[PDB]
Amino acid sequence: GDWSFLGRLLENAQEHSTVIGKVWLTVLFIFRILVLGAAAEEVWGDEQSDFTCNTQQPGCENVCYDRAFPISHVRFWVLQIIFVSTPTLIYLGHVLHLVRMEEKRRIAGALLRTYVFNIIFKTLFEVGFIAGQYFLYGFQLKPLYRCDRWPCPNTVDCFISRPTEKTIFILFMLAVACVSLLLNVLEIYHLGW
Template identity: 45%
Template sequence: MDWKSLEGLLSGANKYSTVFGRIWLSLVFVFRVMVFVVAAERVWSDDQGNFDCNTRQPGCTNVCYNYFFPISHIRLWALQLIFVTCPSFLVVLHVAYREERERKYRAKHGEHMRLYDNTGQKHGGLWWTYLLSLFFKTAMEVGFLYLIHHIYDSFTLPRRVKCGVSPCPNVVDCYVARPTEKTVFTYFMVGGSVACVILNLCEIFYLIAVRAVMLKQQGTVHTSLKRIHSGKKVRDVKI
């Protein structure tokens, strides 16, 4: 997987993000993608080859490994990183759509005319797109955390598992390669995911709070204008 290409694409969405979004992107690439590429893949590179069972029955080791580890942690984390970063592309696409509309509008009405004050400003539909992308990212993070915990029953990898699945002749003991090291990386990745969820929630509340303040200010301005116009009409009548 070419993570550099993904980073290049997300850097375009970074300039439209809030401060929480920029921290989130830094956290994803520094503490999750870098750890995933540099260390985590190597830690799990021998997970199946060094999964040993105390039997020589052909096929027993492979079946037991597939039974206890139906999906590799590495593949789940790769899918998680893809799914939580893809919603940011919706914001980039929406801004590109606005820029194309702006270009056509200027071509039709003249270069001095503007359809948007700022195509990347989070107002109207772009605000909703950005907010929905945050909800989707948060849902994906929580969903994958639940999925990992549900599949493996815990974030801690056991040192030994007992397996009685056919074609094993009886209940055999199987041993996981480097379980402590893998448990440490699992908790590190889970901690990074939880931190990203917290940042997403903070950004959601921040966007809603800023929008509420803006709407309140606009309502106050409209009310003041109405009062001014009403006052002028009363004075005109008296005169």
């Protein structure tokens, strides 16, 4: 996808942010957005095309792929990026609003509360997506999925495309997410002390 606009806004955000925040935005751009576009989207491109079920039943592969993958991992990661970035956009907008207010007439007062809330929201959204992915997929895609959804007769064996590569990238993104959490914790403590 085209992340250009979000890029513009977040680049603006870098200036009005802590050094650790600039590190966080670098991580977001490089290890999350760029990995997803350059590497992961191609991994998941044949997810349903090369999903195969051992059966002659029409409609079984469709319902089985749908039950195994209610949302694709890459779409989940898109949404995670958007939601962890939204607080930064809120804070940046409040900052620009105060600048416009000054013109009509760095981090302190209302902006400090807003920045702390921004880090907080980023952390909660962060953790939330991590836990949701754990409960939806664990952290390993196995090659076999056994499916008993109508119209499949009895239980059918279905086979995943590229499960090991997908597992590698699942874990890569989990690690990047954990690094982001650590960075946000560092921001909180660094402001505190």
